[PDB]
Amino acid sequence: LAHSKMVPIPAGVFTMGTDDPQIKQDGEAPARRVTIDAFYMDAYAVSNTEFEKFVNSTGYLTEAEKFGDSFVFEGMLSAAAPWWLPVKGANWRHPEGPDSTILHRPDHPVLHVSWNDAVAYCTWAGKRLPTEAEWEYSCRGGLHNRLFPWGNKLQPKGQHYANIWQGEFPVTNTGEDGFQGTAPVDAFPPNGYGLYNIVGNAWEWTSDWWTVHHSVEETLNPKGPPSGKDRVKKGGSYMCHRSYCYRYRCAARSQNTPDSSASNLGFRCAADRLPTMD
């Protein structure tokens, strides 16, 4: 009902990255101290309904619609890996291909949106993408040097805290956490700053160009490198399992070309100040 609401992320200093990297190729290390000015972050990833308001207002055609295909995980059917298929007619309204629909999942995160699509939405909304540092600071939710937004245990108190994979990937997803594919954007507990599904569910685009080479120097509101070929995405998705993936940590990070899209990748917006009410 308020799926475009923002929360205030307080000013602070935090440790970005980790000196105990789990996927070393991704440049999770070194840990570095980063200062972040107070700003606002969407509580929820952008949902199908919210994206549809944007498309209704602007007529925007997404990159996947213009290309005529997008990547779909083979386990969702009725490339980076054999389980990623380029499906003709897969896009945000048709997340598994032309015979699928979003009618029954209006409150789920929008998928098959490229980095350019995400920038278009956020700017239409009076907002912007978060930087990687803003995203990671917000993900950590006021905790220092923890694996997850909520701490170091995957299932605190025996409860699922995010939508990831259980079972044997890619053949069997048991749905133990309540969701095979995506969950509603307001599912699961919030983190300490009031964000929902910051890890898991679907990946989220950030504004930074990708590099794996980071300095240990302290920085203020860093924006990432001035050039690159891929943009950074964060958080992991409903596909992720410890056995092959382990990217549902705040420090984890991956990348895609900005015209890329997939069935497990969306976004949320940020803003320096609140945009106009309504």
Ligand X SMILES: *[C@@H]1O[C@H](CO)[C@@H](O[C@@H]2O[C@H](CO)[C@@H](O)[C@H](O)[C@H]2NC(C)=O)[C@H](O)[C@H]1NC(C)=O
Count CB atoms within 10 A of the CB of residue 140. Answer: 24
Number of residues interacting with ligand X: please give it, by CB under 6 A.
4
Nearer to ligand X, 25 or 56 (CB): 56
Distance of alpha carbon 121 from alpha carbon 55, whole angstroms: 9
Nearer to ligand X, 98 or 151 (CB): 98
Tell me the residue number closest to Ca ion, measured at CB.
235
Nearer to Ca ion, 39 or 165 (CB): 165
- 260 with 211: CB under 8 angstroms? no
- 270 with 127: CB under 8 angstroms? yes
Nearer to ligand X, 49 or 219 (CB): 49
Residue 49 interacts with ligand X (CB under 6 A)?
Answer: yes
Tell me the residue number closest to ligand X, measured at CB.
56
Length of the chain: 278
List CB contacts of 87: < 8 A, sequence separation 6 or more: 69, 70, 71, 72, 77, 96, 97
DSSP 91: B
**Residue 53: contacted member of ligand X, Ca ion, none (CB under 5 to 8 Å, by partner type):** ligand X
Nearer to Ca ion, 93 or 234 (CB): 234
Nearer to Ca ion, 50 or 65 (CB): 50
Question: Taking every pair of C-alpha atoms in the chain, what is the biggest distance, in angstroms?
Answer: 51
Residue 193 interacts with Ca ion (CB under 5 A)?
Answer: no
In the block, which residue shows the tokens 């619609």? 65
Question: What's the helix, strand, coil split of the chain in %, to 5?
Answer: 15, 20, 60
Residue 22 interacts with ligand X (CB under 6 A)?
Answer: no
Residue 56 interacts with ligand X (CB under 6 A)?
Answer: yes
Residue 53 interacts with ligand X (CB under 6 A)?
Answer: yes
Stretch that binds Ca ion, among 120-128, 132-140, 196-204, 257-265 (CB under 5 A): 196-204
Distance of alpha carbon 41 from alpha carbon 131, whole angstroms: 11
Residue 60 interacts with ligand X (CB under 6 A)?
Answer: no
- 236 with 200: CB under 8 angstroms? yes
- Smallest distance from the beta carbon of 178 to Ca ion, in angstroms? 7
Stretch that binds ligand X, among 39-47, 48-56, 160-168, 234-242 (CB under 6 A): 48-56
Binding site for Ca ion (CB under 5 A): 163, 177, 179, 197, 201, 235, 238
